[PDB]
Amino acid sequence: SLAPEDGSHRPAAEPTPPGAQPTAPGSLKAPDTRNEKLNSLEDVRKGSENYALTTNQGVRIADDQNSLRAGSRGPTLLEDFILREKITHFDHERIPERIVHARGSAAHGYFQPYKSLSDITKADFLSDPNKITPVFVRFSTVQGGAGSADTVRDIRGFATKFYTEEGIFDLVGNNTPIFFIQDAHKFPDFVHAVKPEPHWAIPQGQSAHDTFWDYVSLQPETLHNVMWAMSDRGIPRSYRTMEGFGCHTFRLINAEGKATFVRFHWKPLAGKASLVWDEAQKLTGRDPDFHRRELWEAIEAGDFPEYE
Amino acid sequence: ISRLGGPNFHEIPINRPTAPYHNFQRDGMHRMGIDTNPANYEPNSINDNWPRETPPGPKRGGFESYQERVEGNKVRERSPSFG
Amino acid sequence: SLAPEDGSHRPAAEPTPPGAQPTAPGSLKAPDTRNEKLNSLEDVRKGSENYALTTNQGVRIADDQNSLRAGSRGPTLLEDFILREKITHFDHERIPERIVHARGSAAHGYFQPYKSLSDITKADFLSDPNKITPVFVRFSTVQGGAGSADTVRDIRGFATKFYTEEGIFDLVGNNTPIFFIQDAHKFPDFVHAVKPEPHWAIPQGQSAHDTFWDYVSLQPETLHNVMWAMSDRGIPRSYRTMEGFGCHTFRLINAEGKATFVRFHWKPLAGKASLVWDEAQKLTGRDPDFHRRELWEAIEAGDFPEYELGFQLIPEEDEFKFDFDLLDPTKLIPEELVPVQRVGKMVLNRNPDNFFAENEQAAFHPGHIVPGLDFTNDPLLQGRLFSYTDTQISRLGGPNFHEIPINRPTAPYHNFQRDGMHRMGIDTNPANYEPNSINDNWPRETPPGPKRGGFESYQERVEGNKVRERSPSFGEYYSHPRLFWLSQTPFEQRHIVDGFSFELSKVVRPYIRERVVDQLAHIDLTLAQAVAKNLGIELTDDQLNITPPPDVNGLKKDPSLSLYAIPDGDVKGRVVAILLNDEVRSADLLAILKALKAKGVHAKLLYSRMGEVTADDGTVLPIAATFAGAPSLTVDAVIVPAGNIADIADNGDANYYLMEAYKHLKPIALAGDARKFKATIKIADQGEEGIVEADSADGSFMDELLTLMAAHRVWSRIPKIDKIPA
Amino acid sequence: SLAPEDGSHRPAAEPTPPGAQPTAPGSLKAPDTRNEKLNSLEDVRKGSENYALTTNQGVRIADDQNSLRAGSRGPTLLEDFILREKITHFDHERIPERIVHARGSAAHGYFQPYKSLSDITKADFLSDPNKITPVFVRFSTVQGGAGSADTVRDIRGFATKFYTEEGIFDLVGNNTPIFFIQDAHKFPDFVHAVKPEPHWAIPQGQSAHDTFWDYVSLQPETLHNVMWAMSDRGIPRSYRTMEGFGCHTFRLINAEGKATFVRFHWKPLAGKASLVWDEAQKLTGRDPDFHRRELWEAIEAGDFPEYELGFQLIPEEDEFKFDFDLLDPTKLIPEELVPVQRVGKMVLNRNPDNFFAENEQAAFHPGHIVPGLDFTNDPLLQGRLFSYTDTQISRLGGPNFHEIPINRPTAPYHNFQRDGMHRMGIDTNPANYEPNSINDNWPRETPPGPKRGGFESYQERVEGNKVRERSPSFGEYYSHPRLFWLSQTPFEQRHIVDGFSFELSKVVRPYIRERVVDQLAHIDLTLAQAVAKNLGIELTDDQLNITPPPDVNGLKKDPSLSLYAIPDGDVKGRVVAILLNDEVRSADLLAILKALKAKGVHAKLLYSRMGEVTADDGTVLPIAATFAGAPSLTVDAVIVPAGNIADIADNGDANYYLMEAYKHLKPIALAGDARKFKATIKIADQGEEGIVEADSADGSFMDELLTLMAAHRVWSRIPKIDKIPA
């Protein structure tokens, strides 16, 4: 047995402050934190302790250290299906990242209203303060790839999937109340302009380059959101300490059929807080996973991110 | 990998084993299984090396190939016995 | 017209030094550079000047600013095909990244051999010193994603696609001579261990976490490549200043059928040079694109990356002449035992036009060999042969990945394979099978021979049972790690100690650190104790008495394993920060730049804001960047000319600039009143080695600075840096 | 393993009648046939003669017969990269077939207008009678898979890609002028209902099953296109002998901005002709590739398929002037009300080289329009515009499907779209966005205007609330089916009755059959009774009293809706079977072939074995096929020359050949003693209209036979075939 005698390989399944224990998969860290969605995923969770190592077809593997070869210094044989299945699955691990917001960090939680909103909306999840709606929330940057740094200067995404009794509602918002552009037809122009430039694929995670500012200088509708990004809004301390916005006017519709225009807000109960530019930029080098880590460790500690 | 869209074709319901399957393979398109193992490699100490290899034996043992003697040069050649 | 009237939007189509012009696609930057492969890509190049904006179907668009809607404040209509085509293409821009080496930077070039190697190989590309072979080379890290940082601590890849007249040959190597594991079956285990951990996908671009060090502690075969990764080899200065290696024993096969064992080498003609860890880490923050940028800018300046191809050659009858197995890819062949024979030179002289189309889509695979080469039973190489074909079916969308333009052979290709997704070639052959009579059996098989023959494998003898078994001969883990460590200078050993100590401090479970210190004590006690001390760990009496492993074939060191033991410095294409003031002394600046120019060293003029300043004599000095904007991390040395020093003397950024460069062992030069800065870095009045100083920037002031830059960094300074708060 | 020395493996590169030579890729059969699009494909056409067989990487293969193994009876080795490339390509050949119209056959050709249409449209391809536009056309069934049969009962597709100077225009039509449903939202319900049922995936190529008739019984909007499918229009003789229609009201826009509604037509210059059901059904077993083969062989013979493009034009102010809605795609515009104006001619004159690359990968989509054309609010068309771009993402592997060679425009295309899987074009533009200054904003938008202008949508007024609601004007379902019924000849009517009767007899659930018959009672009582009688159903008193729907704008019938009521036969390209005997009277064969050749009618010489027979004068006659191997299903008429009739008089296959041809209403001619076969088909001494007979085959005999063939089938024989046991 390879684990240490004293059992110090395994993190306590109780809330612990950052750095006190190794981090762990959520169902192992907090087995008794439940909601309808988390429970419904049990059919696909797979454990490991006390099980035999197998192929994907259920065949027990005797030797997971060697390829099948003709003699112990010989060529590898085509009939080694165990090696080929293992290397095939490896070879095909990756899927395309998101076109934008490829960098992002997510957690499970729940939502509950403070009071029935039936006077203004028939949305079932807003109909009773007793209605508990599971959520899965993903926070993100915009420009950089899935392996880019967290504390860049960028807009941040804030996407919430509400698993309601009357369907999925996704509230797909950002951390500023507007966008750079007015018409969707220009989205690939704006995004190409902010992304790494096409000849050489530089710079990652940064608007600080000629094409972005070229587009901005030629499209003054951009200037409002550019102001937000150049502010310390663009460099939050934590996904816990930033605001969220729905970006658009939507409508609520009530049982009588009356429409009300609405814009959505998320107010962080831990308050608003951002880094300073020098600190953010250096932090992309010292810990490019700083926000991902901070979110995971706040939840492990019981410092649950809360938004109104 | 093209016909069924990727390396997780064993998780398409008709294809699934009824026998247990556990290993350190991860990800791929259409991934259904949510692995809770702290480890995705072996040997590991962080999960006490589970899931673990199993020696061959008379029942419920690991797969080991028959130790057939191979002898010859690397050749692209049809056996004369096939002619 | 949106372009400025003075044409300042268009970069000069001629060699210019870094920062002088905006960068540009290669065919616009350097239209006069060519080779056979670049010429053949012309059929797919797309221009843009003077053309109308269209759909992909060739319909001209009138308004590319708006969607179609019912009234100008109305709903967007489904019939807007111009919107949905444009948004559809955007929606599907991304393809899966490489499983490993996803972060990489690539350039076109050419290779030519120094003489015909026909006595040892029939490979056509090596048959004639006049035969010039286009190449495309991609350098990469291993762990991080395509949008991770360049100057991480990691292994680097060094992949070369040779477009030979007898097929594609891909030499898919790394910047170290070995690998972490012995058998390919373990590759997903090792890679999973070094990659971000699967619960939370942390950390990116780093081996400094529990699962990596768990695997290493349990798999001593890894320690040799770990030594390399923990040394300054893991943080190169530039893709231009690292070695490349082919990793495995392959074979050369001559026209007579004789097989010779070969390992492949690339020697950087710009010399070997690496960063230091604090600098490398901070640089991942200040410019995560530094190596990609440096490569592109070197080529645009005419500082073409050059590498010499070399072979270590071992006769077949010498297979068992060494203390280690030639097939064991965790073992290096010391150059003291088998010298590198020079073979030819490769020059990278053109950037791509489109990074996605040429770099992201390029597919390299070590099974892509040509007649004159062959494999061996290296069990890591054996498994690689499966992987690099397989992985392309998802990454590049199917089995016609050779028809993507960058991947196309320049040699003819004809066969009976048909269809598949993205099929470009339209085959007119009446037959799609052989043997056939309906096309007189064309295209036809070709017997092997001295030139232009079919591929036939070398008839190596195979004997033994079908086994999943590691060769006993591979069961030795410590002697190569030890040879490596003993071959390093004392400052290089110090940086290895600090690499392990820093990485193990990030491992959360203490027993994993202890287990790895135990492994170190099997390699070298001094190493092990120094790492232990940094971790607060005390070696046991048993650990103190572990017998060191034996030397490797009589060797107690091999200086070729050191970056620095043997000077191979080259200052051409290096860069100096010049720290400006509002009244620079022109005569200092003239002499600085004249000497830098004469050796091909670049400069960047830095100040506290953008714009210009004016020297004493009225010369207008344009500013490249601010002190904060272009940190010392990004340059090789700093020079401060004389003048109105009081202007920058209390500037935090300016002071810190010299502290950072000082800490990172870079040459510093101070002329006249700029000597006032000696106080910020605590330099004595009689001066110290590595700090150039004088009343004015010449006679021998630039020669001194340039001598220091040829030696790369001031290693003697290392005992003084701990004191400086930087 | 090679070609025969006589060169007989290779088809002559000259036009040759069906069966005279093996068929071949178009560029080899007809190398001098060119057009702008065919030429532009030269970059990707790949030959084979005199080339070495290689891997896809350009490595010559020595042994393409064997895997690499350890000894010649040993295991195959993983290092066999030649085996794995070849098998990997093969393992990934297939791409997803089209959701609908998966079964299709395609050819290249060209179009030109008869005169400039600039008064009604500014479309460049309709602007000049001497501007030629390349086309690629694919004909298809709808329901069955890509390996289903051709001569099923189904709607046919007729899709034309016009490669115009101002962009690709795809006219994506069918062989009937309406569709089964009104709103695109129901398309998956209808298609799922006609497709193989989901539990067991039966039946292929057939609407004759419960789910289809369940949907029709519940959605009377479908009854109009059902009437067309049940008629002989559902079983065309050839893609050369059916009409095409664009299905929707589109708009033409002229340079002055005037909009005219238009519906598109294609008139077959070879005339309108269909099979009979029993023949069609049996032919799906004897030759499931009959229409694919006939199309390919017509083009190899020079019987180029020709179609006339025609437009129904309705001025904008006449939108509401009919008693149906112009935007309802279940409604046709009778040519009695709105005549088809002839517009131009399309000729299909070359087959592809590789069916997969050019046919299977072609992507047609009706949203691919060009300036001068525009859409309408037809709610079926509206949703089609979403589907034809979306579906290519999976079928063709991503958003670069326009780079697959067959799909590329010949017109320039330049834009700021980048990347996507298997990206071919390498963009050099410094800019990938607009507005930009860095490339002076190229490529640039272009204002709309008379010619070469940007696309702008016609400024149609929209007024209404956001609703999911069917227009009340669409809620009439029976008048157009009735118009169609009343316009058919009596034998066409009988065949419609028979198609409904045959289909509904395969519906297992009897209440579905009853509900369909109730729908038929709302269209025409005579039809409804005739179907009921065949299903053993008796109409109720109420059903008997259903008031017939109103005439369509005063019309009692419109003969243009019939296949046959107005003669339009053309025999060129048709085929006759000639049943040989072992001593043919050469004088008869001489006169038969001379007359057939004068009208471009082909012949196939049949016998009871293959090889040769010798005629009375020593002429050696090669045999194309046996009586069983090329049944009368595959020909238009049968001729039996004189000679040694005893040789075949008691041959069961030869007698049956005539019985099947007789049953199927085909002309038969019998010369000399071949008149003895009159007994097998019960023709009286006096003779019968449709049986040509004389002492010998002469001028008069062949004229009579060719007159019969110009009328396609012998409809007057129908009363006589009930009794024949065939």
Ligand code: HDE
């Ligand atoms: C206001 C909040 C907001 C706005 C206004 C937009 N984004 Fe987002 N985006 C996609 C496209 C898209 C378009 C076409 C527009 C304006 C027309 C916006 N964006 C502006 C996308 C390409 O479809 C996207 C990429 C992956 C994906 O699934 O959809 C996408 C991502 C995205 C996210 C990430 C959600 C997640 O996966 O975690 C968020 C938070 C936004 N967008 C916000 C957003």
Ligand code: HDE
């Ligand atoms: C010797 C230099 C070297 C070695 C020993 C290995 N890698 Fe590499 N690698 C792939 C798999 C693979 C396996 C199975 C093994 C040992 C079993 C190695 N690696 C060790 C791959 C997953 O098939 C890979 C990912 C993308 C791809 O197409 O192949 C792959 C990448 C890779 C590159 C990247 C080439 C490029 O596109 O720039 C390089 C330089 C190596 N490997 C070197 C290498």
Ligand code: HDD
């Ligand atoms: C809203 C869905 C929809 C509806 C309402 C229609 N179509 Fe369609 N059609 C498709 C959605 C579609 C498709 C699913 O997108 C296909 C199959 C895959 C493809 O590329 O297009 C297709 C293919 C397709 C083809 C085959 C082109 C080829 O040869 O590749 C033809 C000829 C037609 N259609 C014709 C018609 C006609 C005459 C319609 C009646 C006016 C019609 N379609 C309505």
Ligand SMILES: [S]
């Ligand atoms: S937004």
Ligand SMILES: [S]
């Ligand atoms: S290696």
Ligand SMILES: [S]
């Ligand atoms: S239609």
